[PDB]
Design an enzyme around this catalytic site. Structure first.
Site: not given
Ligand SMILES: CC(C)C1=NCCc2ccc(NC(=O)c3ccc4cc(C(=N)N)ccc4c3)cc21
Length: 245
Positions: A46, A97, A196, A198
């Site tokens: 992702h 993923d 971040g 992620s």
């Molecule tokens: C680049 C961004 C907008 C993006 N693009 C593709 C789709 C996509 C999916 C998830 C995310 N990531 C998140 O926004 C995102 C949001 C919350 C998160 C929370 C956890 C956690 N609860 N430990 C763990 C990981 C997490 C990742 C961003 C995108």
């Protein structure tokens, strides 16, 4: 990371920081990675599913601060970007993923091990710590949901793994969490992973050895009650990780 402790790369020698260049010049931070071998790194798809170009990323094996050249670092490029061929992302649950970013320096070399640059271990078929087992996660992700800026120094925390049936309860994730996912969290919900962090390493200590058990994927909010963080069950993907490396 939320709460936790400020560490340094020397404590997480396998953490790779992935950046991306924009059409114009600026370079912002994308996601976190784990070094599997000199020529490889494993993250989450992702992070790249929207700009599947290898020429867009930069990976770091030895950076402590987000805007600094922490001693002992090495800059890399992505020779090959292999995404799992059936990725899909629902309202929360992120399917298949997991991804591969085969690195290479401009001279054409892979990672060169040091006190700062090392690698973690692959799991084995049918062998993940039993719930309750504490593990750690590293990342430059947010410290508080209500922010727009990533922390200038790497952070780390410990969480406890949660069973499958516990994370599959109604007040948790329901059936949106399959068997190929893991859940982990602070039993008091004060520390966790966030945007971040992620795609970063979920390291449990399996059998005396440190192991890359999970991969930061999804999760409702950050450090919210009965809302663990989900991770890709790395082990399961052995016949995949293997056949493309
Ligand atoms: C680049 C961004 C907008 C993006 N693009 C593709 C789709 C996509 C999916 C998830 C995310 N990531 C998140 O926004 C995102 C949001 C919350 C998160 C929370 C956890 C956690 N609860 N430990 C763990 C990981 C997490 C990742 C961003 C995108």
């Amino acid at each position: 990371i939320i709460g936790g402790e400020f560490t340094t790369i020397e404590n997480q020698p396998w953490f790779a920081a992935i950046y991306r260049r924009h059409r114009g010049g600026s370079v912002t931070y994308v996601c976190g990675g784990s070094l599997m071998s000199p020529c490889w790194v494993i993250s989450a798809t992702h992070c790249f599913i929207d700009y599947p170009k290898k020429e867009d990323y930069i990976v770091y094996l030895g950076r402590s601060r987000l805007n600094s050249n922490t001693q002992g670092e090495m800059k890399f490029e992505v020779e090959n970007l292999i995404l799992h061929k059936d990725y899909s992302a629902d309202t929360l649950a992120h399917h298949n993923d997991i991804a591969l970013l085969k690195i290479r320096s401009k001279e054409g070399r892979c990672a060169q091990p040091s006190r700062t640059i090392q690698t973690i271990c692959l799991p084995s078929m049918y062998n993940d710590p039993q719930f309750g087992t504490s593990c750690e996660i590293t990342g430059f992700g947010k410290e508080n949901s209500t922010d727009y800026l990533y922390p200038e120094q790497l952070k780390m925390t410990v969480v406890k793994l949660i069973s499958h049936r516990e994370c599959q309860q109604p007040h948790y994730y329901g059936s949106e969490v399959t068997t190929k996912m893991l859940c982990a969290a602070d039993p008091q919900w004060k520390t966790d992973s966030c945007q971040g962090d992620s795609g970063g390493p979920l390291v449990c200590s399996l059998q005396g050895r440190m192991t890359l058990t999970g991969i930061v994927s999804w999760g409702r909010g950050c450090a919210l009650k009965d809302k663990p963080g989900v991770y890709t069950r790395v082990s399961h993907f052995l016949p995949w990780i293997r056949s493309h490396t």
